[PDB]
Design a binder for this molecule. Structure first.
Ligand SMILES: OC[C@H]1O[C@H](O)[C@@H](O)[C@@H](O)[C@@H]1O
Ligand SMILES: OC[C@H]1O[C@H](O)[C@@H](O)[C@@H](O)[C@@H]1O
Ligand SMILES: OC[C@H]1O[C@H](O)[C@@H](O)[C@@H](O)[C@@H]1O
Ligand SMILES: OC[C@H]1O[C@H](O)[C@@H](O)[C@@H](O)[C@@H]1O
Lengths: 121, 121
């Protein structure tokens, strides 16, 4: 039942509600920072903030996952990369040739889970 | 081609990448504030910030739209309301019995357009 609708005119500079991503990472992802909002704990080391340009979106992803999120790395449609950040635990999963719309999940002292909404090309 | 995939375990507190919404509003929406990130101009009056709780999402929307976004108002699945903020220009459109996933769009000195990704129930 997923879809989208457009409202408004044709002007302005296109933006995404998913506008910037950073992480706190050690052996796991202690937190994911979405638009400067903290989602996780206080451990780990804070990575620099990746800010999407207008029309730039996540196109490729590799996630290492177990009971928590062990590692994350992604690439945008304009050739920019983020990570890999995290450890070697968990199991690997990938998203390829996509347009990531939204990054949700659950977090505590660590980043427990991620729910990525995306268009598959 | 829209879908989603889950990674990780079952712990933690669920969050949304669309975690808070505020607006600058006059006769139009001068800006929409998503997770504290400014999308629009400096005119209008800054509304208070609406922060979603865990498991709370936008379920109903009314948007007044023309060349720009004239007005916005929404209600969550837990009975909370936001707005209406803005003017009486444009034409009215609605989203009903949905779960809003992501709010994108384009902005300049005003909020030009909105692209709402949502699940229709
Ligand atoms: O990522 C989990 C954990 O990994 C390492 O042990 C350190 O960086 C910690 O600070 C961090 O919390
Ligand atoms: O994030 C890992 C872990 O952190 C905290 O201990 C709690 O919030 C747990 O519910 C969560 O699973
Ligand atoms: O919303 C457009 C415009 O509406 C009103 O005229 C005032 O509140 C302005 O400050 C605002 O920029
Ligand atoms: O936001 C309304 C208007 O604001 C500015 O003048 C520019 O960014 C325009 O492209 C945009 O359409």
């Amino acid at each position: 039942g997923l879809t989208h609708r457009k409202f408004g005119g044709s002007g302005g500079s296109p933006f995404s509600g998913l506008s910037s991503i950073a992480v706190r990472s050690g052996s796991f992802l202690d937190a994911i920072i979405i638009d400067g909002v903290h989602h996780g704990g206080s451990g780990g080391n804070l990575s620099p903030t990746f800010t999407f340009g207008s029309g730039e979106y996540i196109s490729n992803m590799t996630i290492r996952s177990g009971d928590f999120i062990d590692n994350i790395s992604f690439e945008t449609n304009m050739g920019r990369r983020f990570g890999p950040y995290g450890g070697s635990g968990g199991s690997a999963n990938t998203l390829s040739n996509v347009k990531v719309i939204q990054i949700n999940g659950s977090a505590g002292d660590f980043l427990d889970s991620l729910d990525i909404y995306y268009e598959q090309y």
